[PDB]
C-alpha cells in the first residue's frame, strides 16, 4: 500500500537524493543514461505477517483492525556512483539523520543486513548495480464503524 513508498521517502531524504532518480521496483520505468545513479526499492521479497491486532474505541466509537508485518525490501543502487550511494547509505542508515527524519513514516527501519555488487547484464556490457538488504517492519491498519453495547437484558432459570 504505502509502505514501499514510505521507505522510498526515507531513502529520499536520508541521502538528500532526488525525486526523479528514485524509481520504485519491478514496475515499468526506463533506466536511461546508466551513469545516472538510480535507487530502486525492490519490494519483491515476500512480506510475512506477524500479528493481527484488534482494538476498539469507546466515545468516538469505531474500532481498529491492525496487521503488523515485515518484508525484506532490498535497495538496488545503479549508476557510476552506485558504490558510494550504497556504502554512504549502508552506513548512514543508523545515524541521527535517518533516525530523526523517519518521524511519521509508520515504518520501523532495521540494520542493513548484507550487500552485493551483483551487476546487470546490459547486453555485452556491465552496468554498476548493488543490492543492500534490510528487513523493514510496519503495520497497516483500517478503521471500521462498529457499535458498542450499552446494556444486556437477560433471564435465568433454575431447578
Amino acid at each position: 500500500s504505502q509502505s514501499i513508498i514510505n521507505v522510498a521517502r526515507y531513502i529520499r531524504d536520508l541521502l538528500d537524493y532526488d525525486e526523479n532518480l528514485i524509481q520504485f521496483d519491478r514496475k515499468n520505468t526506463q533506466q536511461s543514461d546508466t551513469v545516472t545513479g538510480y535507487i530502486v526499492v525492490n519490494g519483491s521479497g515476500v512480506q510475512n505477517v506477524l500479528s493481527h491486532g484488534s482494538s476498539y474505541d469507546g466515545d468516538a466509537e469505531i474500532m481498529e483492525y491492525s496487521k503488523s508485518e515485515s518484508r525484506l525490501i532490498t535497495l538496488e543502487f545503479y549508476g557510476s556512483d552506485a558504490y558510494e550511494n550504497a556504502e554512504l547509505f549502508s552506513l548512514l542508515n543508523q545515524s541521527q539523520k535517518a533516525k530523526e527524519v523517519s518521524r511519521g513514516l509508520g515504518l520501523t527501519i532495521y540494520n542493513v543486513s548484507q550487500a552485493t555488487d551483483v551487476k546487470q547484464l546490459l547486453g555485452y556490457q556491465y552496468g554498476n548495480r548493488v543490492h543492500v538488504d534490510f528487513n523493514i517492519q510496519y503495520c497497516p491498519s483500517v478503521y471500521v464503524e462498529t457499535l458498542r453495547v450499552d446494556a444486556s437484558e437477560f433471564e435465568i432459570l433454575v431447578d
Binding site: 524509481q23 520505468t29 533506466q31 543514461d33 551513469v35 547486453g123
Partner: protein, 114 residues
C-alpha cells in the same frame, strides 16, 4: 586475386567517429585517454532494439557497421548521439577489403576527450 567488396561499400557510406580507449592507471586509479578518428562506414540495425526486463527496464540500440578501415573490439563508434561498443558478431574480411561489427550503445555519455 582476392575479391574486394570495398567499391561495393562506398555508395552506402556515412561519416562516423571511431574511438578507442587506452586505459591508464596509477596506484589503481582509473583514467582513460581517448583516440578519435573520422572514419568511413555504413550502418544498419543489428539486433532489433528491444526492451529487456529487470528491476528497471533498459534498452541498448544495436548497429552493425562496415568499413574499409580495421576495427578492433575495444573501440567505440559514434554516429548520431551515442557511441556503440564494437562487441559482437563482428567479422574481418580484411583480406577481402572490409570488416563489420555489431554495436552496443554504451548508455554512458559519449567519450569526447576525458
Amino acid at each position: 586475386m582476392l575479391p574486394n567488396m570495398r567499391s561495393a561499400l562506398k555508395m552506402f557510406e556515412q561519416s562516423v567517429l571511431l574511438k578507442s580507449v587506452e586505459t591508464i592507471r596509477v596506484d589503481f586509479v582509473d583514467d582513460i585517454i581517448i583516440t578519435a578518428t573520422p572514419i568511413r562506414a555504413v550502418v544498419q540495425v543489428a539486433d532489433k532494439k528491444k526492451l529487456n526486463l529487470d528491476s528497471l527496464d533498459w534498452s541498448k540500440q544495436y548497429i552493425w557497421v562496415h568499413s574499409g578501415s580495421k576495427m578492433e573490439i575495444g573501440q567505440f563508434i559514434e554516429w548520431h548521439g551515442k557511441d556503440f561498443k564494437l562487441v559482437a558478431a563482428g567479422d574481418d574480411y580484411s583480406d577481402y577489403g572490409y570488416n563489420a561489427w555489431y554495436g552496443e550503445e554504451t548508455l554512458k555519455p559519449v567519450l569526447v576527450s576525458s
